[PDB]
Amino acid sequence: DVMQAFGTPEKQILIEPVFAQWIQAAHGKALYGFDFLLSSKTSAAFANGQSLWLPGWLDAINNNQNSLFLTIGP
Amino acid sequence: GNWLPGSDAPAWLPDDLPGNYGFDPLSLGKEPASLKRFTESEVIHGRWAMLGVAGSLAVELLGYGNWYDAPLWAKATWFGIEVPFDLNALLAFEFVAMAAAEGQRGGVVYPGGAFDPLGFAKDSSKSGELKLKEIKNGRLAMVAFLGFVAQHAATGKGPIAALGEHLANPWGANFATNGISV
Amino acid sequence: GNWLPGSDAPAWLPDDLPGNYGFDPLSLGKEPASLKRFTESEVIHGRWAMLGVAGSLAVELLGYGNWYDAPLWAKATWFGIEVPFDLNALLAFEFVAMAAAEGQRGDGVVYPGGAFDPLGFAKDSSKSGELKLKEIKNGRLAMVAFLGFVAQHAATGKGPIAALGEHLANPWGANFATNGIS
Amino acid sequence: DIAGLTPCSESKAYAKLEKKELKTLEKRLKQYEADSAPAVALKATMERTKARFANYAKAGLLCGNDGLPHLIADPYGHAGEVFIPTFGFLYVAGYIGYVGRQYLIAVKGEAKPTDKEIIIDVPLATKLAWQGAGWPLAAVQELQRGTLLE
Amino acid sequence: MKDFTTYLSTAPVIATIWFTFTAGLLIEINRYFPDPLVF
Amino acid sequence: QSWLPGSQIPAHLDTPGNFGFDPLGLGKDPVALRWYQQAELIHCRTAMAGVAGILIPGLLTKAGALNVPEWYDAGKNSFAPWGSLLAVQLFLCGFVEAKRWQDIRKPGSQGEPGASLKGTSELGYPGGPFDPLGLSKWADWKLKEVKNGRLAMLAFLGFVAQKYATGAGPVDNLAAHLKDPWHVNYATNGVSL
Amino acid sequence: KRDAALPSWMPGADLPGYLNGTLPGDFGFDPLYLGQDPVKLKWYAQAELMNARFAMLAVAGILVPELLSNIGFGAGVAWYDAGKFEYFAPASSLFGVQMLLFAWVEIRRYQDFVKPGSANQDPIFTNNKLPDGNEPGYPGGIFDPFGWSIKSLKLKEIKNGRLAMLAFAGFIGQAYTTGTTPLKNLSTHLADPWSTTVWQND
């Protein structure tokens, strides 16, 4: 607030939630570009269920007009 | 000879145990009830992983097989020959086989009778000298098999091929070109 | 005669030992238990590196070849004759050959005989002693020479008998001082 | 880059946040002469504010779609953001705490200790103050020795 | 002045003579090193 | 022998390198003082060594004897991986430091009947195979060993700081000064300390 | 606390104790007190002789080949530019053989310092031995073949040595500034000594 008040929002302390952003990546959201588990196309976890339900899943997680694992910031 | 020079060996490991070099810092075998259990399971892990290694060396040792690429077929394939089926049939007749024979352990280290036909265990004065060698070939294998799994996840390669890669370029290709430590 | 004029020889080297000239300044043999070991392993080093020197000379003067350039073929070549097998075939049938015969040398003798003295050189009486001096002093001298053979070639020079030749042409010119000082 | 967020050295929005703030102060500075007092302040602030933006671009922080620098708090591109400072605190806080410990214990044995919590023995405290410089080396040795816990 | 110094070494006085010090220190450092988000 | 003559030396040094220095009173605990004495001893030996291979190279380079790089730029070079080198080093030292550590815990411990004549001597001074020539009435060596050590410990910290400040070799820094001492200083550079 | 009636260097001043007039050439000079501990006098006493006899040899090696080469006799050069490159072997070897032959003789002499009668007899032709001197640094026999038996004599050694040691320091110093042979430095000094001091030349 004080930084906002003095007209210097660039001085804010904004910590990015790296840990949740990691989890979302492991779940297959590709925004953050960590490439883990269900993000990475060369992972056993991906190759196992890719012809099961993941196409319906991954399609839904990455539609950001829906509520499923919303985008996260400071 | 204990595992760390100087150090005093704890009260609970009598050195009349086979291969006691005084290693239980975490003091997991403090209680003798819980110790007798681990003395048993040690020997079994020891015994399996000794076959486990011996086995998954012999596979790729003389033939273009590999222990990581063995299950591919899920037609099985022993020593170049065909096979007697599939998945369900092996599971069933491995479940019952194992479940029965391990079920009937009403836990022993040296059950003998059937398991020593040729008759080595016998002559008290050397009986112990084997049980050391038992557990040390036991441990050395359990380490090696972990060594076989660790190197596989880093590379693709495969035990005897990794050994051959290291002999070509020893200084070059070793364990600081993967990621256990960066 | 002890190794350094003046010096007193320590309490632990009895001079009834073969070739004891009173050298243990680092006092590594103070403890007898650890002396009996090194007296043993001095003789064995003594032996091998006697053949060692005898062998890797012979390959350059007579036999056509060099001890540094010998393993090049990793088809083997004995005297001229294309030896059988390759590498693997030699590992297995050198492991088992050495491992067995050394592995049955422990279960602590320097001068066994029986098989190993068929002619009967040591035996009664005085002679046996006098030979064991000669045994360790040709033993040492050959351990020193072999290190001379690695040192001069190890990082510089060329061939043992060739380096000797080079020195005989230009002794004031080509010696140790060309790559040993700089 | 990390979490897909751009670096402040490159990012457009961040560089347009530069412009807006500066061009707020240059709309003020018009209403004053150049020789005047407040003009030296509205120039000096600008100089400082324009220097500030430059010094995060050189620092290399990650700026988002917002235009604001976000921070990284685990591992090594962005150590100095949190990982170094973090120790800074645990030191100086540990400093304060352990000095305070050595004071209360040092008083404890002296008939009435409660007087020394109020009329503080300054020349006791100022000796413990400096002693409390090497505190982790003492704190460890005290955990070892086994005088640390009741 | 043994008495006057004991008063100056009273809790509320020390606190204030301590805080004007560690306040200045932090204002001071924010002058010559202005606007930190690193170091 | 005192480090500041007049300053009352703290009690816990009753003269057992002892010039009375321990202001913050680290070693008041005699547990801590025995441990800390060998920290020093190890810190000295490494640094005397290390600096010898910064200076004696660095001095001979100007002399012309050896074409050695500067100590910052001797890392970077092709033979083996550094991962390997560190690993093999970290492997090899870890073994031996563990033999020091058990000596520091249980002095004799390194003489178990089972290849160990490297028993001990006194604490921090192992001797025997670590003393080929063998030196032992004049144990003034024991003194220089700490002193020449603290000198070298400082010397390195100096190297590290005085390249951070001028970005040039200690053998250069030594000349630059010697050429104009009063205009090339501590006081005529980047940072005031 | 200090001898009264023996050679001084500041007449009236005090010899300290440890300089008894025992060693050869003691007039009791040790301002910095380097000879305090009688262990360390033992080394230095010997150290002096070695350093002395190398200088006295060396300074003769330096001067004579100039004294002759100017009279004109057959090889004569500059005592520093001499060792550059002009010999039947290379630099490297001549050192190797030198370092070898010495390493032998010095560890021989050193054992005699450590234990006074340890090395006095041939170990090959073992009937050959140098007599029971019992005096390290003054070993005798072969080394005194014409047989000068005296305190007189042992002064004259260290006095000549102290003088020679300098003369050599001079040679280093004098060369390093002036850049010619020390007899050429003495020529130019003797031509116009007054206008050619150090202060003139500095």
Ligand SMILES: CC(/C=C/C=C(C)/C=C/[C@@]12O[C@]1(C)C[C@@H](O)CC2(C)C)=C\C=C\C=C(C)\C=C\C=C(C)\C=C\[C@@]12O[C@]1(C)C[C@@H](O)CC2(C)C
């Ligand atoms: C300064 C230092 C220690 C300082 C600590 C001090 C002042 C302690 C003092 C006090 O505790 C007392 C007594 C009492 C307390 O009440 C107060 C304080 C004041 C706290 C250690 C440095 C120690 C310095 C060391 C060990 C450095 C060693 C050097 C090495 C090995 C480097 C390696 C290389 O340089 C080579 C050799 C060759 C190059 O080419 C490449 C590389 C790889 C860079």
Ligand SMILES: CC1=C(/C=C/C(C)=C/C=C/C(C)=C\C=C\C=C(C)\C=C\C=C(C)\C=C\C2=C(C)CCCC2(C)C)C(C)(C)CCC1
């Ligand atoms: C690294 C990092 C991280 C993480 C972390 C963690 C995970 C942690 C944990 C932690 C823990 C898990 C802890 C524990 C603890 C315990 C205990 C038990 C404690 C104790 C304490 C004490 C005892 C104290 C004392 C003292 C002192 C010393 C001084 C002052 C005074 C007093 C008294 C207070 C993060 C990511 C965040 C960030 C980045 C970095």
